[PDB]
Amino acid sequence: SNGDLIEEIQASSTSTDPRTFTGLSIVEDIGDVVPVTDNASPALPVSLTDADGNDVVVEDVSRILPLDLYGTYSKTIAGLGLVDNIVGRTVSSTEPALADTEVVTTGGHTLNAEAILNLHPTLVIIDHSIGPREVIDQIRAAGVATVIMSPQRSIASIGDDIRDIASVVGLPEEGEKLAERSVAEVEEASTVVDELTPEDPLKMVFLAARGTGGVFFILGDAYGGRDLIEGLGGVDMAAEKGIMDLAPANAEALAELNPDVFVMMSEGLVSTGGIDGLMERPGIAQTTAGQNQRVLALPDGQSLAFGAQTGELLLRASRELYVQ
Ligand code: HEM
């Protein structure tokens, strides 16, 4: 599907200065993960010690709930061959295959125990990027095999995070194939990013926006803002300022960070009123990025998911950032 995207990248002139670009650039949804197999056959049972130290036996993966903040696990499970086993999702797993699949979070990202248990899951794969913890404890006590992950969520660890998921569902060979394919795709995209990156990198921040009120934050280290921005050839000003979790995107913060580009989730930007609404927020219009109305909007459920589609995300995003 990249045949025409790559022709546009090769065609960009060498004189092109990305600091002169203005306005929104949006990456369209990348879609479903291409599975590495059509006939996955989980080798079960598996016993493991999960990231919280719990001993878990996985003996039935017919009804999976792969749940997290970022949208990673549902995509990896589909990449391994088990998309048809997914029986519920969070709001972050926006991929088309799951669009008719029951949502088990409420009010954004809150786990709902009743919704989960009414789906009669046989395996929950989850991490503490969403909660409450108490709901995770309740479904385990009710009898649902629950596996806590703690993925490294860096570009360098995309492959190991995939291998860890594959080991939970008894598909090590599919895991090795999907890991290697996903890391090769990143490396290929990184060479395009390097060829497109200006000599002085663009300053970026990841701006989280949900609604027209106070859900308006600079995302820090813990969410993976830095890993994405550096993967795009940028400098993450949140990382420069030592933001480990998040910081309010108020006028003082924005003035101090002074990015050249705001990186945002697409539906997040819509929810604050689009570019016009974002430009009304205090401090935005005064930054370099605001003066150029320069926003890179990425599909919400891929933007911080990393995983299998990272390379495609970096390729499309670097074309939007650096190619006119
Ligand atoms: C910090 C407080 C946050 C609140 C109160 C919040 C709330 C919400 C709400 C209410 C939605 C529903 C949007 C819709 O139905 O279209 C949503 C969607 C979403 N959120 Fe959050 N969120 C927060 C943080 C985050 C963070 C840190 C991430 C990082 C991955 C994230 C990722 C997503 C994604 C991927 C979606 C799906 C948007 C879509 O439907 O396309 N959220 N959030």
Residue numbers in the entry: 33 to 356
Study text:
HmuTUV forms an ABC-type heme transporter system, in which HmuT, HmuU, and HmuV are the heme binding lipoprotein, permease, and ATPase, respectively. CgHmuT consists of two lobes connected with a α-helix, both of which consist of a five-stranded β-sheet and four α-helices. His141 and Tyr240 are coordinated to the heme as the axial ligands and Arg242 forms a hydrogen bond with Tyr240 in CgHmuT. As CgHmuT is a substrate (heme) binding protein that shuttles heme to the cognate ABC-type heme transporter CgHmuUV in Corynebacteria, the regulation of heme binding and release is very important for its physiological function.
The purified heme-bound proteins were crystallized, and the crystal structures of H141A-, Y240A-, and R242A-CgHmuT were determined in the holo-form at the resolution of 1.30, 1.65, and 1.30 Å, respectively. While two different orientations of heme were observed in Y240A-CgHmuT, heme was accommodated with a single orientation in H140A- and R242A-CgHmuT. Except for Tyr240, there was little difference in its structure including the conformation of His141 and Arg242 compared with wild-type. His141 was coordinated to the heme iron with 2.2 Å of bond distance. Two water molecules were present in the heme pocket, where Tyr240 is located in wild-type. The oxygen atom of proximal water molecule in Y240A-CgHmuT was superimposable to the oxygen atom of Tyr240 in wild-type when comparing two structures. The distances were 2.2 and 2.7 Å between the oxygen atom of proximal water molecule and iron, and between that and the nitrogen atom of the NH group in Arg242, respectively. These results indicate that the proximal water molecule is coordinated to the heme iron as an axial ligand with the formation of a hydrogen bond with Arg242, as is the case for Tyr240 in wild-type. Ferric Y240A-CgHmuT showed the Soret, α, and β peaks at 415, 575 and 540 nm, respectively, which was a typical electronic absorption spectrum of six-coordinate, low-spin (6cLC) heme with a histidine as one axial ligand. The 6cLS state is predominant in Y240A-CgHmuT, which will be caused by the hydrogen bonding interaction between the heme-bound water and Arg242.
